[PDB]
């Protein structure tokens, strides 16, 4: 196809698309005699998957595995759901440690007077002084 | 078809002959213009050949005028930026009764002052060495410049006397140490060598070598030998 048309359909740009391509994460679209990256429908929907996978959170490598499954007709939906729930687990732990963060942040905040003073307890307790 | 339509070429060209380059080379470029225009002409569009050909010609000459016409190759996009910019500033000095300020026409041109300023730093042409700075033919400009690159004789004598002083100081110290320093620092040879190279040429030592050149400084700091080189502290 033409390239901008495909990237405005899918929202990407030729630069990001070419990054993904150099990562070997989709079908390589052929060129033309002139050199335009010859896209297709296969490239279109492979790109759509490679886009939405990192949105889900499957990384470059893992989204590439989703793609090579998208090429594979044998693909194990079983595996796919293991990958799914594994990433669910990482996102859970991410949430939990961020909750620990915000908890300690608010513990430090609410103790601070916020009375435009230089004697901020947060500052001095973040350093191992006194 | 070529011979049919040459007067078209001179017409276009002498519209474009605003005094950038010269007539004939522009005209010849119009001729290659016309050649490739005819080379791929659909005739069942019904239109007249003239216009199709014409804009291909325009592209040929407006490209070549860009590629050439300067000692300094400025690629095309800078050129068209300049052209755009000047078209703008004409309007700005209609309306303000004044030349414009970079900030003003830049923010109208939707880009920050740095690029504008650099474009302006870059734009002007060279200045013809043989121009007569003399009001009459008493002087050309090529007379009143200097070779600020070459040498200076006093400096050559300076370096030579410094070198004499240096190896005079060397010969006062031990042979091995002075020689090891010559290769360490490349005196009286082509090259330079370092801790491990010079060492393992001599022998393996590393840290006591450092301390050896240190005590060399100690024997050299020595306020009897500096004074032949105290002058070169200014050096």
């Amino acid at each position: 196809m033409n390239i901008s048309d495909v990237a405005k359909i899918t929202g990407l740009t030729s630069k990001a698309i070419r990054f993904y391509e150099e990562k070997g994460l989709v079908t390589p679209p052929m060129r033309s005699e002139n050199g335009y990256r010859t896209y297709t429908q296969q490239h279109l929907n492979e790109l759509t998957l490679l886009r939405q996978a990192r949105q889900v959170g499957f990384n470059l490598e893992e989204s590439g595995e989703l793609v090579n499954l998208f090429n594979d007709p044998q693909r194990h939906s079983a595996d796919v759901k293991r990958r799914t729930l594994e990433k669910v687990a990482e996102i859970e732990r991410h949430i939990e440690e961020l909750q620990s963060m915000r908890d300690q942040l608010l513990a430090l905040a609410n103790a601070c007077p916020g009375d435009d003073s230089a004697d901020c307890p947060i500052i001095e307790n973040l350093s191992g002084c006194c | 078809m070529v011979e049919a339509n040459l007067r078209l070429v001179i017409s276009i060209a002498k519209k474009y002959t605003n005094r950038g380059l010269q007539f004939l080379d522009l005209i010849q470029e119009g001729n290659i213009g016309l050649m490739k225009a005819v080379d791929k002409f659909e005739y069942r569009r019904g239109y007249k050949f003239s216009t199709y050909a014409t804009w291909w010609i325009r592209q040929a000459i407006t490209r070549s005028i860009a590629d050439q016409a300067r000692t300094i190759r400025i690629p095309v996009h800078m050129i068209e930026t300049i052209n755009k910019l000047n078209r703008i500033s004409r309007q700005m000095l209609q309306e303000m009764g004044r030349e414009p300020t970079p900030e003003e026409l830049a923010e109208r041109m939707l880009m920050p002052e740095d690029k504008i300023r650099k474009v302006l730093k870059i734009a002007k042409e060279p200045i013809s060495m043989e121009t007569p700075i003399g009001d009459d033919e008493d002087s050309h400009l090529g007379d009143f410049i200097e070779d600020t690159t070459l040498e200076l004789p006093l400096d050559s004598a300076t370096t030579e006397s410094l070198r004499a002083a240096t190896h005079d100081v060397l010969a006062g110290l031990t042979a091995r140490e002075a020689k090891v320093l010559r290769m360490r620092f490349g005196i009286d040879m082509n090259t330079d060598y370092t801790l491990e190279e010079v060492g393992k040429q001599f022998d393996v030592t590393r840290e006591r070598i450092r301390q050896i050149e240190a005590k060399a400084l100690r024997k050299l700091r020595h306020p009897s030998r500096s004074e032949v080189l105290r002058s070169f502290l200014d050096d």
């Binding site: - | 004598a157 300076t158 006397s161 004074e227 032949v228 002058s231």
Partner: protein, 50 residues
Amino acid sequence: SVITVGPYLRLHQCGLPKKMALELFKPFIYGKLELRGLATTIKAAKKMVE
């Protein structure tokens, strides 16, 4: 420079301002200063001239 008249002279002679000949005969001076040992080297000699 400009000329003027020396009437008390002997015609095998000429007038001369100092600083002209001073800068003209400069490296001569540098050399024999090194020779006498006042200025050890060239930079010092040049400073003493200045």
